[PDB]
Write a protein that binds this ligand. Sequence first.
Ligand code: HEC
Length: 108
Amino acid sequence: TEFKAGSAKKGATLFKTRCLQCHTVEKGGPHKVGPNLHGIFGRHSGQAEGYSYTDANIKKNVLWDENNMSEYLTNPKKYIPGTKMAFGGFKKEKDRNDLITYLKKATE
Ligand code: HEC
């Protein structure tokens, strides 16, 4: 719709430098500050096992699809008030395009 693929290698690195601190993407990868992100697309928020998500994340019951992840990536707190995710966001659409590209390939 409003989602455009960019670079997976670029996105791989945005992840490492901006998301790796609190999340893993691999299947069998563990939860850390953040929950493991394997299989997140198609998935609704707050459903990873062994993970304690805020009341905020839970009740948002957001269906993770690439378009959705873009709004969130711009301003998670604005997008999900009450969330403990400590990420200020991606204001540049290319950044978001590029990371979603990566996530879409890495989390499947
Ligand atoms: C790099 C920009 C990041 C991406 C992609 C994601 N995050 Fe995080 N994140 C953090 C916490 C503590 C939570 C849980 C929130 C709560 O329980 O209130 C999250 C949550 C997410 C989610 C939603 C997960 C779901 O199953 O619904 C996604 C898609 C997500 N995060 C992607 C913490 C952190 C964090 C620690 C300081 C960082 C750097 C990031 N998150 C960055 C990213």
